[PDB]
């Protein structure tokens, strides 16, 4: 029993984290085989930030301009290139701790673990979701750029986020590991602002299933709703539309608990319209939306890595 915000074991990723310094600017990099991946804004002086031309700033650098430190070992950079908003520093040594891995670009609403790092040293691990507006609600200070987000499947680490920057509202923006930003954001000092965010409906439903699995039924009712009618209430409360695909994804959890997806939707509609009346669900007084259906199956059934 119990239900926690649960991150993947971070060990496979810890062994990949390094420090990258260029001039007076330092941040973290990701060492896989003989390549170190990091945010390209490492090559930027603060004076370069309002409208950087990175192709220009990079042609002006040499391999020796990049200091890569793996613990207490300097790695020598033997080559460099830009791919989108990430730098790839080729180094003389392959990482002997390179896990089995892939790079994936996730969809909004998907969750991942973040290994927050400073000076190439891991500091903490937490879970978060890619918001519908393509920000993440992370926990990041100066120095944390280059920390990565990931999921683990068996022994394969799927990297899906590299951290770059913090927006004025205190939420976070970054790229996939091939350097493409999530959302409309650019690695320039400019006015940029997240689009208005929405609640991830399919995740809220999954978490209500998690609550049922853990013995909490107070919010259930005997009504059903139609998809169309539920989606009408969703839009009024700033919830993402629920699709037939979402319904299908929630299939396994509906099956385990015997609660039809559309019946759970009637529960959620009541919760949206009436509040919680001083009650909690899995220890929250808010409707939680950063557990995917997969997260719930993973934790209520006990899958390992």
């Amino acid at each position: 029993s119990g239900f926690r915000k649960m991150a993947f074991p971070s060990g496979k990723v810890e062994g990949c984290m390094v420090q990258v310094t260029c001039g007076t600017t330092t941040l973290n990099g990701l060492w896989l085989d003989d390549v170190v991946y990091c945010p390209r804004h490492v090559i930027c002086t603060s004076e370069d930030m309002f409208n950087p031309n990175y192709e220009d700033l990079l042609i002006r650098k040499s391999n020796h301009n990049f200091l890569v430190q793996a613990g207490n070992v300097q790695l020598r950079v033997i080559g460099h290139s830009m791919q989108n908003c990430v730098l790839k520093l080729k180094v003389d040594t392959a990482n002997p701790k390179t896990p089995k891995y892939k790079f994936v670009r996730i969809q909004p609403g998907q969750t991942f673990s973040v290994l927050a790092c400073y000076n190439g040293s891991p500091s903490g691990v937490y879970q978060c979701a890619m918001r519908p507006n393509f920000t993440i609600k992370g926990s990041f200070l100066n120095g944390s750029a280059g920390s990565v987000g990931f999921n683990i499947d068996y022994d394969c680490v799927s990297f899906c986020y590299m951290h770059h920057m913090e927006l004025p509202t205190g939420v976070h923006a970054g790229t996939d590991l091939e350097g493409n930003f999530y959302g409309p954001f650019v690695d320039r000092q400019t006015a940029q602002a997240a689009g208005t965010d929405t609640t991830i409906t399919v995740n809220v439903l999954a978490w209500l299933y998690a609550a049922v699995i853990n013995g909490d039924r107070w919010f259930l009712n005997r009504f059903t709703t139609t998809l169309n009618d539920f989606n009408l209430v969703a839009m009024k409360y700033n919830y993402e539309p629920l699709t037939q695909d979402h319904v299908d994804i929630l299939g396994p959890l509906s099956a385990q608990t015997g609660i039809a997806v559309l019946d759970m939707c009637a529960s959620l509609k009541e919760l949206l319209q009436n509040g919680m009346n001083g009650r909690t669900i899995l220890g929250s007084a808010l409707l939680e939306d950063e557990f995917t259906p997969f997260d719930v199956v993973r934790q209520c059934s006990g899958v390992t890595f």
């Binding site: 007076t24 600017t25 941040l27 930027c44 200070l141 770059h164 400019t190 006015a191």
Partner: peptide, 10 residues
């Protein structure tokens, strides 16, 4: 008002 790039100064 502005984005903060979260590198650090060495």
């Amino acid at each position: 008002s502005g984005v903060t790039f979260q590198s650090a100064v060495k």
